[PDB]
RNA sequence: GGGGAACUUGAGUGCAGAAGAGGAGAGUGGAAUUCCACGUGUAGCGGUGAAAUGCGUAGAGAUGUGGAGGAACACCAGUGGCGAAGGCGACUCUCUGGUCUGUAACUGACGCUGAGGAGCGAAAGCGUGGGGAGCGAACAGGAUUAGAUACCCUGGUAGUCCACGCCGUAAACGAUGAGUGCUAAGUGUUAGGGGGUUUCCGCCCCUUAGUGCUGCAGCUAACGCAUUAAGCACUCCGCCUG
């Protein structure tokens, strides 16, 4: 139920910030769903965009 | 981007702050027409943009007809300078 | 308004580092672009192997251009035998 | 650049030709022509050793630069010309120093662009580099085997080869027909695709046009007589009762390899 | 030859067992068909369990103690063989559920009821 | 109806934002399937309700490497979003279409519909040239059967893919034409805007536009629809008469 981005009041991802992307991907590398992250619907799509970009850039593994 | 729009409206300005005045509008419509036409030549198959082009040219057409019925003088003085038949 | 990221493989002598980054910045500025800021990361264990390197060198080139220089950049980057990956983003 | 003749007479019933918009001029540069008289399949002693040949339209040879030896001098290209020796079309490119040369016109070449040939040339269409500088996975044409000999291997219209990787003194390159080959890394090839890609789709309508090109008629072996071909003879139209179909000189001529099996080059071919 | 890796496929018709070295070098292998199961009985957990201890017996005489197991595919042999290993006296240090899960891969074969 | 003079709600323009698998072109990347060479490796592997054809001592399958290629973009993913419809999901960039919100600065009825006409229009299919991993009509073999030209198993050509043309059909479905106005509520959810406590979070109240689910009156032959009407009405088109 808790919505991390609107709770801490932060704007768009700024994809370089690789620290929280770990918290938002599973240890397996699977991107966590809304049912567990509790984030807002509008922000989730730009999330998976950011994770996909950094994944292509090899900051996050495709599978761990 | 948007600078040609300002150029066109400012140079076709009839009333000091007119942005309706369909003689002004049809200028922007013609600009969009030929710009999207050069885009179509480089992408033949963009049928959705083709649909947008059809919509916008139809809009320009009925605007022209309305201006014709409103006054022939303004029509003629615009069509001759814009060169379209 | 493009923020370019790219990687240069770890086994570069620090002599040739400055050469390669400097010539890339030369390409950007010569193709009409202007650098709004440069910035680096250095080492980081890659999330996965790419060719044979476990780690790599990470560099950032924050640039504002007319969107023609970066295509030439992409060509030069992919055709250089030493850079591994790179992308361009149109920052809004 | 392919056009159809509407069938007016009966000869043009099935016809296609290539309009020459890719070409930019009609008259060649006098300096680079050389004489050429057609041999018509006759050996030095006068005997005939190549059937189905001779009698075309007379043509004049234009010496092409297959070597690309001149390195470092910026080359400007201003022409695209027709050349009736090989399918491809050529470009007369003039250098900064002031001597001109002919080059196989590659696909996507236009008048006015620049040319470089050094071992550090930028990689575009028309440049030539020793293969060691060439990067993997880049289309290339006009390859050679012995360095300095000049391109031999990919020269016809629309023909191309792909580099599958460098591994040492040699290189792996995928020629046309896909039979990948091992080639020395010190050889110079021309980057790009040969620029007459539509040449295959020609539909020569008339027999007379093939004769203009200089191809004599070919008679089937079956309608020959027994003494002059292994198929000839037999009453009526006979099927060939000779197990394997055979050639005019005795060998079989369907589905069997012919290259002397001990040759040295084989060890490079077999990479495949 | 002290450490190794035991790989077992858990299919719906069979269960293979193979052991290898950390360098990916095989030592010995077994299977339901290797033991003598020919029909659908190869898919039973019992067949895979038997496979487990024959693999262990082929493993001990070369002197390997510690293992960790990779399981492939879904099947009834998932639970049988893994605990059959430690029943055979060996020590398996990790369980890895590695199966080929393509993102899209190739289009799968047609349905079974058309 | 015609003509003249108004006016701004309808319809547009400008101004500030917002969203999106909207479209076309170029390039890029990850897990796999297959094939190939290589190391290790013994005796079967594969498959179904049992089986069999197949592949294996010419060393399979398995398992650890390295290549080669072509197809689709896992979770995110949601009766979510966009598009007029077909349809559209990996990433980046180039070009480009439409929509909504708040405005009130502009024009002042410029609007709706639309026979013929024009363009799009899934999949199969056709023509030319490439490409071909997997799947797979046809076809072969093995099973089942009294028979099995099928259901099942092992292969596998055409196709499936790409570029340009052609065909113009689908249960192309919400089996509900387009536009406009009015007629109880409750409840989710998508993109917003305003306000009340703070310009913290997040609590609530209004508010447009979508997109679902229940449910009055009303309609319905019954199902059921019910502000996303199949209700109350007006224009325009198409279609029906065992």
Coordinates of C-alpha atoms in Angstrom, one line a residue, chain A residues 2-64:
Chain A
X2 CA 2.9 2.3 0.8
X3 CA 4.0 4.3 -2.3
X4 CA 7.7 4.9 -2.1
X5 CA 8.1 7.6 -4.8
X6 CA 5.2 9.8 -3.8
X7 CA 6.0 9.2 -0.1
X8 CA 9.6 10.6 -0.5
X9 CA 8.4 13.1 -3.1
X10 CA 10.9 12.5 -5.9
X11 CA 10.5 13.2 -9.6
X12 CA 11.5 11.2 -12.6
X13 CA 14.0 8.4 -12.3
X14 CA 17.3 10.0 -13.5
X15 CA 18.4 6.6 -14.7
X16 CA 22.0 7.0 -13.5
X17 CA 20.9 6.4 -9.9
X18 CA 21.6 2.6 -9.8
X19 CA 21.2 2.3 -6.1
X20 CA 17.4 1.9 -5.7
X21 CA 17.0 -0.1 -8.9
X22 CA 18.5 -3.1 -7.0
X23 CA 15.8 -2.6 -4.3
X24 CA 13.2 -2.6 -7.1
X25 CA 14.5 -5.7 -8.9
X26 CA 14.4 -9.1 -7.3
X27 CA 17.7 -10.9 -6.4
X28 CA 16.9 -13.1 -9.4
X29 CA 17.0 -10.1 -11.7
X30 CA 13.2 -10.3 -12.1
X31 CA 11.6 -6.9 -11.9
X32 CA 9.2 -6.9 -8.9
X33 CA 5.5 -6.4 -9.7
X34 CA 3.2 -3.6 -8.3
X35 CA 1.7 -6.1 -5.9
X36 CA 4.9 -6.2 -3.9
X37 CA 6.6 -2.8 -4.6
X38 CA 3.5 -0.9 -3.9
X39 CA 4.6 1.9 -6.2
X40 CA 2.2 4.2 -8.2
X41 CA 0.9 3.0 -11.6
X42 CA 2.1 6.0 -13.6
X43 CA 5.7 5.7 -12.2
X44 CA 6.0 1.9 -12.7
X45 CA 6.2 2.1 -16.5
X46 CA 9.0 4.7 -16.4
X47 CA 10.6 2.4 -13.8
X48 CA 10.7 -0.6 -16.1
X49 CA 12.0 1.8 -18.8
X50 CA 14.9 2.8 -16.5
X51 CA 15.7 -0.7 -15.4
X52 CA 15.7 -1.9 -19.0
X53 CA 18.0 1.0 -20.1
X54 CA 20.5 0.3 -17.3
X55 CA 20.2 -3.4 -18.0
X56 CA 21.2 -2.8 -21.6
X57 CA 24.0 -0.7 -20.2
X58 CA 25.1 -3.7 -18.0
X59 CA 24.5 -2.1 -14.6
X60 CA 22.0 -4.8 -13.6
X61 CA 22.2 -8.5 -14.7
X62 CA 19.7 -10.1 -17.0
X63 CA 19.7 -13.2 -14.7
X64 CA 21.4 -13.7 -11.3

